[PDB]
Please model this.
Amino acid sequence: VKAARERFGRIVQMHANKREEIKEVRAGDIAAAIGLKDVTTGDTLCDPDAPIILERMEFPEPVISIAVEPK
Amino acid sequence: VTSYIGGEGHNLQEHSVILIRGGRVKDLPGVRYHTVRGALDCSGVKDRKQARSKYGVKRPKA
Amino acid sequence: NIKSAKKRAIQSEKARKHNASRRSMMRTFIKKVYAAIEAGDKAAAQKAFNEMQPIVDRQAAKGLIHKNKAARHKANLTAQINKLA
Amino acid sequence: MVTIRLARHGAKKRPFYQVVVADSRNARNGRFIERVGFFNPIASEKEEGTRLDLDRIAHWVGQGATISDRVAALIKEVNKAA
Amino acid sequence: ARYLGPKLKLSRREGTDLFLKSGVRAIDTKCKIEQAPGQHGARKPRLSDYGVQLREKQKVRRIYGVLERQFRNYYKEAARLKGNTGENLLALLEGRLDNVVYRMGFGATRAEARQLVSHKAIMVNGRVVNIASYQVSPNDVVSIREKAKKQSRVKAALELAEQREKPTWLEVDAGKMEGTFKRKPERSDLSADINEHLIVELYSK
Amino acid sequence: KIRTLQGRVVSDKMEKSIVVAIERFVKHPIYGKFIKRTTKLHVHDENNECGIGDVVEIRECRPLSKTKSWTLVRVVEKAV
RNA sequence: AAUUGAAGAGUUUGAUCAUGGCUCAGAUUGAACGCUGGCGGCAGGCCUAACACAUGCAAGUCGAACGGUAACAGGAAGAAGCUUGCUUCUUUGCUGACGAGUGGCGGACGGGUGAGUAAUGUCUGGGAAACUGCCUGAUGGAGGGGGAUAACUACUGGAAACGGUAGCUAAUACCGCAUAACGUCGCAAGACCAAAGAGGGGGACCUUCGGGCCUCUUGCCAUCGGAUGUGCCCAGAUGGGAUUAGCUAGUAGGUGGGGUAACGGCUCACCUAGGCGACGAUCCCUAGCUGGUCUGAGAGGAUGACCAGCCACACUGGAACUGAGACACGGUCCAGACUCCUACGGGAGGCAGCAGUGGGGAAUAUUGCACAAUGGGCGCAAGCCUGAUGCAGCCAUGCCGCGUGUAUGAAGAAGGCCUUCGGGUUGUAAAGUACUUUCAGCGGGGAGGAAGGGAGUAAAGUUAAUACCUUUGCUCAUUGACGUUACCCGCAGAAGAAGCACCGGCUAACUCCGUGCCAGCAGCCGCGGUAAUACGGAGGGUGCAAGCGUUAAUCGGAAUUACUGGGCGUAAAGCGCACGCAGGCGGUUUGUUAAGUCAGAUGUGAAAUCCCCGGGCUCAACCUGGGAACUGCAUCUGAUACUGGCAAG
Ligand SMILES: [Mg+2]
Ligand SMILES: [Mg+2]
Ligand SMILES: [Mg+2]
Ligand SMILES: [Mg+2]
Ligand SMILES: [Mg+2]
Ligand SMILES: [Mg+2]
Ligand SMILES: [Mg+2]
Ligand SMILES: [Mg+2]
Ligand SMILES: [Mg+2]
Ligand SMILES: [Mg+2]
Ligand SMILES: [Mg+2]
Ligand SMILES: [Mg+2]
Ligand SMILES: [Mg+2]
Ligand SMILES: [Mg+2]
Ligand SMILES: [Mg+2]
Ligand SMILES: [Mg+2]
Ligand SMILES: [Mg+2]
Ligand SMILES: [Mg+2]
Ligand SMILES: [Mg+2]
Ligand SMILES: [Mg+2]
Model:
């Protein structure tokens, strides 16, 4: 959804009370990828040879607005 | 310092983040820099086709 | 710091303490000789001189004073013990 | 102590050692006392391949210089055994 | 790297056949040689010293199919090498393998010959050579690989080749399809409306 | 031979410690003129053997004090 | 053979010439940004915050120095569930080996950084008063004793970091004693100084049958040499400022004590009153230096990344100890700033090592692989350690190759664009038809970087010995991270692979349309107010091409700081004028001198770079052999016209 590729490096699974390190991450699992450059929320990370956009949940859209000045 | 915003049309306003290029304007004394279209908050020129590298306009999907 | 070549620190402490007491003593004999020189007691000078020579000479070999210092001490002290004594 | 050894001067995947005498404590391609030849583990069976200024080696070996095991093998293979 | 654009047009700008379509007939025409290299090609633009100076070196480049950076390097080398820097430019230029392969008639056009060099379809002194810019020495022998020894292209290639004015500093065959760069070509035995001092002085200012 | 240097005295009273000036002509690094170049050295001469005005000969030597590494050897000319 | 190479143009005016600034064409970059993006080779990659740092790694290693057994194995001062010679428990340090401890060597190397440092450094050249582990050549020593201590053990404190008392033990730890010269002190007579053992094998002989004893290999002491490393001294050269002109008490010298490896106000007392400075001291500001790099015809200017040499620094300030070497990057102590752990009593730490984070920024990479090669630490060795190094990952950042096809193809299709509606152009381009298959892709095979180490066996090498130990042949197994390596051969199919800038003059390239001093362009002059080749689009064209532009930056052009190589009557420029110190310069003859100058000779000017000729990767970049070069410094010896000095005119 950005038409840019990323290179996975370190990977971590939050494991109750320890950020354990992993080298591989299979399907049906969740994790956090360290260091990924330009990945915002809702983006699909697929295989570059077999490319796909996924559904992407929805963005609740704000109900309250306010002006702020930097004191 | 003050800087030019070449090209037809632009966004840019009070809190925009931009990129200064250097380059004067022989019409605006004291203006000694250009704004670099298409870097940071400064969008490229709309619909420009010739010389798009300047004015930061990506190739119109051939 | 967490590198077992910290035992080096504990060793060199033992070393200082050793060198400490010896080099202390050595000096206190070189002190004795000048005591005569200052006192005028011409005999006491050679007495101690000949008493310190073995210390000083050994300490050069032991390598806690290294050679020419031992040389210099007895050297110029000779040059003083018989300049009136 | 001073030693005769190989300093890598080739290029990635195409080395070219330089036999040279130095204080062992210096860096490999660093400060040296004197160069004494080269060893080109490539070249093939061409015009050259190795060269040892054996007089100079032997000279330095005289003042208590030592030989790097790979240089030793190289000397004991440039012959000088008949 | 290669040019790739429409090739006759190039010739049409230079006002000469640079044999980019050596192929067969025409030797040009069925092109409208000169009188319109573009929409405005049909004019007589009186061009400045810098223009002809450009056009001329630009001519040489298109003939051999060599691009600026490499061609610069060819000039810089030519400069360094002893002798009239002007002519020994052409020397490196002429000594290019791809050029030699064309000059020996193994390929119809210089561009064609290049493709041949690229496809490992040519060897030198016993050894296979891929790169079109391989610098050929004297006594070197360029030969066609057996794997592709006389198939359709190279046949016709050697065919109309021999019907062309022929070389001197190298001897071809046609039976074994092999030849020898006998010696470096001298400036006398290659020319036309091609000067140098133009293209020499150009890179010197 | 003995690497030595001539040069006149200057400054007298210092107690076995004469100081000598050594002119030299040298070409200017860019413009080429030859220009004068004084060079003051702290010389030692045991038993104040000379004095101001004297063209003296000296040689380099062991350190004898802070800026003092040259001994007096001959003398040439003296009076005023 | 070998640094053999110098271009101008635009712009002041109505026009001209001159002057003079500004501007442009070239080359270069550790770059960035914008648009675009196929591969490979070699190379480069925090230029800013020497800003703070989570996490892992970056220094260990010897049982052939010592007491040793906790674990691992075998063997067991030898045994079960019985599965009788295959096991897994319990014991034994037996042997391999090895946690912790004493000891030894290393941790002062390797690697990072440019803060500090305008001369406590660096470059070139000289010099005398010094120490120097490991490696080495040589001469002799290697006798005989002694007191301890970690570990360990018994109590005992902590949350932890750490430990506390008491008792015992080994050594190549430690200390006497003997020995004592070609060593130190001394004129001499004389005085006086050291050390250590450990292993492999073995005929007899001997034995508490542990060994003694023999032999071989290592290690220890001492001294004089060598080699390498370092310390110290002098001279010249090494930024800007005078809107900084005075500076100076251990200041300058001497004497005598002390001091260091060593010379020395290095230190201390006394005595002289000096020492520095316009040839720029002092004080400010900036800066690590050189080899070299970039530019330049050169002379110059600019610069100090990558490689190598040198120096300095290791959170900040300061300090010593250990030691051959440190005033110690991953040591110690003290203070500071900061951060972290705490069971609140107390504790811990410094990525400018590699990788990586945060932060700053226009901007700079993976928390990878392997010790296989080279090289370093320890070790007899095997080996172990090694973020040095060798490789791989990431980024078009650069340089160099290569590709993204090749040929054929016309009344010259359509479409677009121009048109005086006759046509012209894009354009042989496309389509179509022959043809090829590099590189990518898929399958096979497959160099080289590997030389060595391990066993065996054969050699008056040894020795008492056919053992042990050393060398070398030969023989048999075997050692790569890269690695699906390079490269080779098969297979399919033009298939996966073109952009960016420009087209008023300088400046290579012209038209229509929109717009109408608007919207905008612009390096410079200047375009725009209705036929705009200058704005925006289009067609066409020129230039570069996996890059192209733009910006930033250095040199060039610039003879525009003019040494080479310029100027001042009116263009900017003669002080209003004289006298005069310092400095610069100096008529004419002889002799002498030999500083400058000249000539020749010898050391030297690191390597890499540049350049020449070759050689090696399919080519090139890249790598490499030898030379030339390094225009310099120093010294000795010469030459005597000119210059300078001295003598007489
Ligand atoms: Mg000490
Ligand atoms: Mg290219
Ligand atoms: Mg152990
Ligand atoms: Mg600095
Ligand atoms: Mg004794
Ligand atoms: Mg004294
Ligand atoms: Mg003294
Ligand atoms: Mg200049
Ligand atoms: Mg410090
Ligand atoms: Mg550290
Ligand atoms: Mg048409
Ligand atoms: Mg034009
Ligand atoms: Mg119009
Ligand atoms: Mg336009
Ligand atoms: Mg100039
Ligand atoms: Mg002027
Ligand atoms: Mg005037
Ligand atoms: Mg006047
Ligand atoms: Mg004279
Ligand atoms: Mg050189």
